[PDB]
Amino acid sequence: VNSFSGYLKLTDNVYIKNADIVEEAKKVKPTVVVNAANVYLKHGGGVAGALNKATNNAMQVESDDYIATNGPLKVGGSCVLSGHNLAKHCLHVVGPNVNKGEDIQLLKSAYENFNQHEVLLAPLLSAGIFGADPIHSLRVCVDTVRTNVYLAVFDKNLYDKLVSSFLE
């Protein structure tokens, strides 16, 4: 149904909210929820672990079957799979992990995957333990994505910092 509510409008197509992406998926029933994935789709921590646990491991079982037959994704790439009980589809997107020395330049390619979907509920790519500067990740999102993106950032201080920085 895509019933998003309580978001701050940053640009004509980018919205942000201080919220857990899992709770937003349950409330919104979006057509697409984005997972902040790794190349072998191992959903142990961060956003991926939170989405997988909310599907009672159904996401991991599906992802393991996909990987066994197709092999790993590339950094900056994506994969559409079932959204299970959270969404119609899950778009698994691999942002670069700069704490593991991956190229930050690939974050544009990661967000470019969103342009295949009219509307998406998504997290901030490459932020948290992936190590990118969260203000830079929001700028790449705004400059790259042309479709409607609703960003859920589950940290009040980080949310207030991104909004404040964007309004400068």
Ligand X SMILES: CC(C)[C@H](Nc1ncnc2[nH]c(-c3cnn(C)c3C#N)cc12)c1ccc2c(c1)NC(=O)CO2
The residues binding ligand X (CB under 6 A) are: 20-22, 36, 46-47, 50, 95, 123-130, 152-155, 158
Q: How many helices (H) and strands (E) does the chain have?
A: 6, 7
Compute the distance between CA of residue 16 and CA of residue 25 in angstroms, rounded to an integer. Answer: 14
| Strand stretches in 71-134, DSSP E | 78-82, 89-93, 119-122
Q: How far is the CB of 23 from ligand X (least distance, A)?
A: 8
Nearer to ligand X, 41 or 127 (CB): 127
With a CB cutoff of 8 Å and minimum separation 6, the contacts of 23 are: none
Nearer to ligand X, 46 or 68 (CB): 46
Structure tokens at 159: 């949310």
Nearer to ligand X, 56 or 68 (CB): 56
Q: How far is the CB of 11 from ligand X (least distance, A)?
A: 20
With a CB cutoff of 8 Å and minimum separation 6, the contacts of 159 are: 16, 17, 18, 153
Nearer to ligand X, 106 or 119 (CB): 106
Q: How far is the CB of 129 from ligand X (least distance, A)?
A: 5
Nearer to ligand X, 89 or 137 (CB): 137
Q: Which residue is nearest to ligand X (CB)?
A: 128
Q: How far is the CB of 3 from ligand X (least distance, A)?
A: 18
Structure tokens at 60: 């991991």
What does each C-alpha distance from 82 to 33, 90, 91, 111, 118 come to in angstroms? 10, 6, 8, 20, 17
Rg (CA), the chain: 15
Q: How far is the CB of 102 from ligand X (least distance, A)?
A: 11
